[PDB]
């Protein structure tokens, strides 16, 4: 196959742009008091509904549908909270100090403190957002990052030597696309690689966050604060 591989840079970023999922809203009802269990329930509700659009977006990512269900499932299991988290950070970019989960759910530092363990992750999430704004992240840069997080994050825990490198061959395409975009923005060859590295170095911070939040999430299930969509249960259970 080659549908994905025989892509222009611009055909690439076009395809990624329109695969974009919609910004959902929160089941947030403000004429009620804010609990640890209330707002943990809100977020997980929101999240569960966001996973279903993510799964459609994934299939719309070039290369992706060429994997068997075990690999698609594994990539999506290992990368899901990272993709949710990079989206959230993009969203609240021009809301410094705040994290826009839903246009009707905009939280800040203190509001995270309403549930225990949550604030540390708020804090990092916020910082990641500030850094995207400092770095002036473009949406064409963002959709590419998102696609990279999908393909890369699980790639080393399934290996299938030949599925392996065709994932690798797409991931290459994307850095090509990503660069071609930096060229086109009028960045100098040395800014091109300098920034390529800045972006990719954050993805590591995003893996660090995903892992911490996955650990927090697991704590809530174990302290019984909220019930979790049978689907979220399967996602957390992919981690251990």
């Amino acid at each position: 196959n080659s549908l994905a591989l025989s892509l222009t840079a611009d055909q690439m970023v076009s395809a990624l742009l329109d695969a974009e999922p919609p910004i959902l809203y929160s089941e947030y009802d403000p004429t009620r008091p804010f609990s640890e269990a209330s707002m943990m329930g809100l977020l997980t509700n929101l999240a569960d509904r966001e996973l279903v659009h993510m799964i459609n977006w994934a299939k719309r990512v070039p290369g992706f549908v060429d994997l068997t269900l075990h690999d698609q499932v594994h990539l999506l299991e290992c990368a899901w909270l990272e993709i949710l988290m990079i989206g959230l950070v993009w969203r609240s970019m021009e809301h410094p100090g705040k994290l826009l989960f839903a246009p009707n759910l905009l939280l800040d530092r203190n509001q995270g403190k309403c549930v225990e363990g949550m604030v540390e992750i708020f804090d990092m999430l916020l910082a990641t957002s500030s850094r995207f704004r400092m770095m002036n992240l473009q949406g064409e840069e963002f959709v590419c990052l998102k696609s990279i997080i999908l393909l890369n994050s699980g790639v080393y825990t399934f290996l299938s030597l030949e599925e392996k490198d065709h994932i690798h061959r797409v991931l290459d395409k994307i850095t090509d696309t990503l660069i071609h975009l930096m060229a086109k923005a009028g960045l100098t060859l040395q800014q091109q690689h300098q920034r390529l590295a800045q972006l990719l170095l954050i993805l590591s911070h995003i893996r660090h966050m995903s892992n911490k939040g996955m650990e927090h999430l697991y704590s809530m299930k174990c302290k019984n604060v909220v019930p979790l969509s049978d689907l979220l249960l399967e996602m957390l259970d992919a981690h251990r």
């Binding site: 799964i55 269900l69 698609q72 499932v73 999506l76 299991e77 399967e234 996602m235």
Partner: peptide
């Protein structure tokens, strides 16, 4: 039978 497995062909 995994919810995610079915969702991916849904």
């Amino acid at each position: 039978h995994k919810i995610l497995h079915r969702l991916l062909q849904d």
